[PDB]
Symmetry: D2
Subunit: 232 residues, 4 copies
Amino acid sequence: SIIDLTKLEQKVATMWDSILTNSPFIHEVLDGKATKALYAIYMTETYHYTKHNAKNQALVGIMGKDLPGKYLSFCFHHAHEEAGHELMALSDIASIGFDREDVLSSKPLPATETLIAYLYWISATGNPVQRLGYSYWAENVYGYIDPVLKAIQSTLDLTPQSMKFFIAHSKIDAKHAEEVNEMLHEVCKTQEDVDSVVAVMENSLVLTARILDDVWKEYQLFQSGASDRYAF
Amino acid sequence: SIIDLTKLEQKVATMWDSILTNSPFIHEVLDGKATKALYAIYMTETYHYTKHNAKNQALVGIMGKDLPGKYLSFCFHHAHEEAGHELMALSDIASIGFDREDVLSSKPLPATETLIAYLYWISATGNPVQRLGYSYWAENVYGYIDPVLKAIQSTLDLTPQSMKFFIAHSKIDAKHAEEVNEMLHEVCKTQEDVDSVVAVMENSLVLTARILDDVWKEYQLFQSGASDRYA
Amino acid sequence: SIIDLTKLEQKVATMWDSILTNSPFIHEVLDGKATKALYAIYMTETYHYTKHNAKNQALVGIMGKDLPGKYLSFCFHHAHEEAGHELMALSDIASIGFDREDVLSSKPLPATETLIAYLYWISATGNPVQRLGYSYWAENVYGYIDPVLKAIQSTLDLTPQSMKFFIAHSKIDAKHAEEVNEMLHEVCKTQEDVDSVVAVMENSLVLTARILDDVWKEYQLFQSGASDRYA
Amino acid sequence: SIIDLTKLEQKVATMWDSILTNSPFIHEVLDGKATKALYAIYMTETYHYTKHNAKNQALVGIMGKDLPGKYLSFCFHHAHEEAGHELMALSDIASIGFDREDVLSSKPLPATETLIAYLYWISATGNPVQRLGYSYWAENVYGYIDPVLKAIQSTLDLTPQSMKFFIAHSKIDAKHAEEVNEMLHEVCKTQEDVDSVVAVMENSLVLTARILDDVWKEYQLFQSGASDRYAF
């Protein structure tokens, strides 16, 4: 294999370190000061972008030219596996006493809309291998964010029922992680293939981090600033 | 359920009757006059449109707005099930002594390119339910074409190895027909939904029938003055 | 230049000869038997595919990779020139006493939907030069269909007001034919480029001819048992 | 008319104020310390996103459903007017002694790739009116960035020949600005139409500002850090 996954693992570990050290959202949570409203604001944006993942994954298989047989199957298989996953986030929001309808009628925050656009773009154009970079960190993510999830669970005294989105991830994503890694070794033939994977891995994570910044800004404005939300 | 599948079955039966009674290609086969070249020309075009089915099926799931949960799952599941199916046609061509490379480097015939265009268009636009009309006759075809298949097998003395495309996935095909029928009852809520399914069912079959015409024209030119083929 | 437009002109002339000699629609008109209903059914389908021409022309410019500068400009310029042209067909229908709303709420006939699908497909995929084949015959049609137009004008005693679609933009049409020819010499660098232009020219005209067949079938049903229309 | 352009003008003026006050790139220029390399790095990214503008403008006309007649014409007309505009940026780069080929073979910076994705997305989906928001600030832009352009012209002692991209803008964009404003009044029927225009105006400008940040980071790394560039 031409791809060195220890090198990608190293870049991902460096990026999370920065995100967790600099995000006020993450510090607020780890201090033990997360609230229902904060968790909802954040789960709402997760719902918004997650809603498009099956679709943009399937798009690689439609737009990609001369993909290896295994890669075309992979795209449709995983699109099928991801379909509806956003409902788990919407279920978690309902589990903490909020209205599913307020979420369904909401427009995504600008950072989230920006991530959504990026993911369709890199799925519809360029080196068809590149979306695997998103999947690479997206699937081996539980190992870095576990302390943040454990702190939210403690502060809001949540049960696995109000945390289904992150409970699916750490069970059948230890398999999906293995599947992504095997697919990466199969489809990466040149260094240009690897470079495109690294470029998408990096930017998709940079863009996902900006969502935390939008979530935090709207959370602060939430007390007075804007009529954007409903506290019950 | 608002859809009456016996009515759809009746329209399909009427259309096949016409196609089988009027296609010179079909009579040639039934007359016991099929040749390796004829089967290969035909399987090559099947290869060209089948190559796109997984892709246009997945496309309904991407372009359709507010699809029932079961239908979005259905689109991606079925795209996954169809992925690679064209390889079975390629394999049958190889099985009768021809080169897989001459197929891979060939351009589809005009009627085949026309069907491909149509199926992408009805998958990307309009009432998202409509592609199920294509699937309706397509998953339930073997019963009408069985005699044509049996005659090809006899003339060219073929084994199941040279006929994977039409009889490898027979148990799978029976399950897919049931799944399409169940999905049709599920997603058709208004008569406009049903009409869109019927329009696509009809036109996709009309366009598929034009492929037989192109195959026959090029076959007659094949034993003559069109060096478009190799044998 | 690598393209020989006299060769293209010869293939187009051969194809029209066939369409005009075999279409019952064309003979009906030439026999002096056109009616308002017949012209409206036909203009309604013209409206349906013309509605998409600006859009699929613009699409070549968006999907084409590394197009010569002049060709990208050409695609967007011509899309701009074509925008709204379907309104002229709508206007002609209104001019002979029918309701513009019955046209706007109608679904295209299957053959028309098939042409629309094909033109988007060849604009979105393949050799980006190929749509120019459609334009080639389409901008240079009036000379072959002139007698049919003249016969319609006589039977239904039409003025230029009821025939805007075919004779309002005549000076503009002559300039567009020249522009397509110049662009063809400019963008065709290899024989594969030329072949792709010829394939599209041929199939787009074959598919347009199928519209005449659908128009005739529905017209015969119109004075009978298809309440698909209003008169 | 339902849209109040003085309100949009006010939001744009507030955003530029922030961008110009906080961008190290902009301060570096206004101090009189811009260099050929800095101008090239920046013009290269302008080239990258400008290259797609005619295309994403034409896309609104292809994807938009039931657009007013004047709006469909507008989309194709303006796509035609924008076609090739990126060549002016590439011409400016050549005018200061750099190789056009180094630009053509370069991949856009992540912030630029992110803007490109966003613009196609908002052009292919949602309320078809919304891309006019990008055009709104894009066309009435010369009035805020004029001092930055005048400082670059002085430091690098440039003639109108090495500044064709920003010389086209301030002549036939006083017409385009008027055309956008007239089109906005024509196509905005509801407040939801206006809101979509405002949302795109804001995010497209936020995303364009991030390009300045990527340009600056790569410019600093340019002395030692990375082999990404060529100083001649």
